[PDB]
Amino acid sequence: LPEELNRVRLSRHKLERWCHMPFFAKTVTGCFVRIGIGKPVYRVAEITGVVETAKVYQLGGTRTNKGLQLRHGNDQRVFRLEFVSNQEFTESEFMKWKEAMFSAGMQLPTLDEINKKELSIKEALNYKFNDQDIEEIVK
Amino acid sequence: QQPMIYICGECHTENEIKSRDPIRCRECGYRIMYKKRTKRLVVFDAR
């Protein structure tokens, strides 16, 4: 179902806060983003690791140089956080992802995994910034 | 869901300062910041 899948989808507007929050390699690793390839076609790639680009690009008022190790089944390459689409998982893209995962041999993540993963986002949103994260943030 | 927006005294940047939080601008770290104007109805006579 592409509806439950949209609960583990990180729109560009929300991640602007998490661009600097630590534990980043632990919350996003397991979510699915709608990255752009390019004409209006899209592929559901998998957030595997947290990489950094040498290209510092301004993402609205905030600015970022980090990359994202995304991969659509077998085709993996570097990606920047500007090309991700706020569009939800459509049906044709959902089936295309299903065919890219059944063609690669990767197991489909069990629904219970998604249900336990979506709450990580809301608990990270409501995290009290009481520790020394503000100082590393400002640096 | 109102996070209590403050205005950095130096940067003039808006800052969200909920309870139990240190006052620092997340841009500068500056320690002085001012509340933004009210949202209520401010009406004057021009008297």
């Binding site: 729109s11 507007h13 752009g36 390839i37 390019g38 609205g60 689409s85 706020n86 | 869901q1 109805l41």
Partner: peptide, 25 residues
């Protein structure tokens, strides 16, 4: 009265702001 509707600041994207493509650059 003096109130504000919506009450949901996080993701009112209102589509969006012209998402740039990867294969366009």
């Amino acid at each position: 009265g003096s109130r504000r509707p919506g009450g949901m600041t996080s993701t009112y994207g209102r589509y969006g702001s012209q998402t740039p493509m990867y294969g366009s650059g």
